[PDB]
Ligand binder design. Structure first.
Ligand code: MG
Ligand code: MG
Ligand code: MG
Ligand code: MG
Lengths: 236, 236
């Protein structure tokens, strides 16, 4: 069947800082479809943000050129490894729906778990290639799923996994994801609600930058092929 | 005053084609804030889309690197002029919220009117540099406005302006914009309703790719700096 892609993001910064070192960039693939690049750079605040932007940018450039996701992740690593002399790490994920291969690809270098929903049944997946920027020969670990209606992917930054840690009551990630992801729940509502649960776990003072990325594939129930995108930034 | 920023896009393609030649890409600005890059490649279909992705990708790269918006537009022009040997053109606009300068910039090489909302009313503005790609000495025109509550910018592709040509009754752009953009209307609803007005004017058969980009700055009504992004698109 034809598929509709919903992607959504909800994110905030560590309490006490004025910006996040987590970057999510969205890029249109020249073969059709889209990618989200999630980078969580070492550190917080201004410097962390500058570097996460450039790391994301290294991957986004290559994706724009139709370079394959794995190669793009390796390039982002090579960039960070060269520019910071093997001293700074970052978590990197690339989450793609490739409308030419009819596939969802997840290229992971993060050491944070993800959730996968298969028609409402969620599981936690710990497979990743670990962080980029430090080991010379770092490689992504890769997941590929047929792009069918009912597939959901939830990717987070470590600030979500860390929520509650301050008071020794860590967020139960898999349990909270399955809870919030109802059958008709839109991607944005999953992302919003997972982030809110993490914020409640940190008593409203994020202990680290927090980012939730949700992909939901569903059946087509809009007849005109309209593409939409929206960004909201409160408190600019 | 502090502002909450909404950016929304609604877009579809020319009837009888399978893809749009118009591209919108979003990029986070290193100095703080973001840019939307709108490109309408010459013609329609896959050729036009290749061209517009090529230009948009260049402009995103430059803005990610911190190249100032007017310089970025000229460099995107230099890139197209080189890659296609001076033979092909594109309409380009860059719409930026610069959170370091507290301003909204519109860098124009499109030759398509825009709408500007302020003082509780709308105006149509045609100031622009030429299309990019062909003329060696192309330069952007840059409009800047303070980033304050109550500011709206609506950018469109020429398929919106030309809607209603077939039936003899062109879409009334300013009247429609003012009608659909009431004080409390969200950016996505404005984008959607203007797109639909254009589709209706073309009797449900889009005469040329149609893209609506809406930026709305509003008073802060929220308390947590939680950024949200959403993309909804066919795979298909
Ligand atoms: Mg970080
Ligand atoms: Mg982190
Ligand atoms: Mg065109
Ligand atoms: Mg056009």
């Amino acid at each position: 069947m034809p598929v509709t892609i919903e992607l959504a993001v909800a994110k905030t910064h560590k309490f006490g800082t004025r910006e996040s070192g987590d970057t999510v960039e969205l890029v249109e693939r020249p073969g059709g479809g889209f990618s989200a690049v999630l980078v969580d750079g070492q550190g917080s605040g201004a410097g962390a943000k500058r570097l996460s932007l450039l790391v994301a940018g290294a991957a986004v450039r290559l994706l724009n050129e139709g370079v394959r996701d794995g190669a793009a992740a390796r390039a982002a690593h090579d960039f960070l490894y060269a520019m910071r002399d093997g001293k700074v790490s970052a978590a990197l994920d690339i989450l793609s729906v490739d409308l030419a291969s009819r596939s969802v690809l997840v290229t992971r270098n993060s050491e944070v778990p993800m959730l996968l929903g298969r028609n409402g049944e969620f599981e936690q997946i710990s497979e990743s290639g670990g962080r980029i920027g430090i080991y010379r020969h770092t490689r992504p670990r890769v997941l590929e799923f047929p792009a069918e209606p009912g597939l959901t992917v939830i990717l987070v930054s470590d600030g979500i996994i860390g929520a509650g840690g301050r008071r020794g009551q860590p967020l139960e990630f898999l349990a909270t994801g399955g809870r919030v992801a109802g059958p008709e729940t839109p991607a944005q509502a999953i992302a919003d609600e997972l982030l809110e649960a993490a914020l409640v776990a940190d008593d409203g003072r994020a202990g680290d930058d927090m980012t939730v990325v949700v992909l939901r594939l569903r059946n087509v129930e809009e007849v005109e092929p309209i593409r939409r995108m929206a960004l909201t930034v409160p408190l600019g």
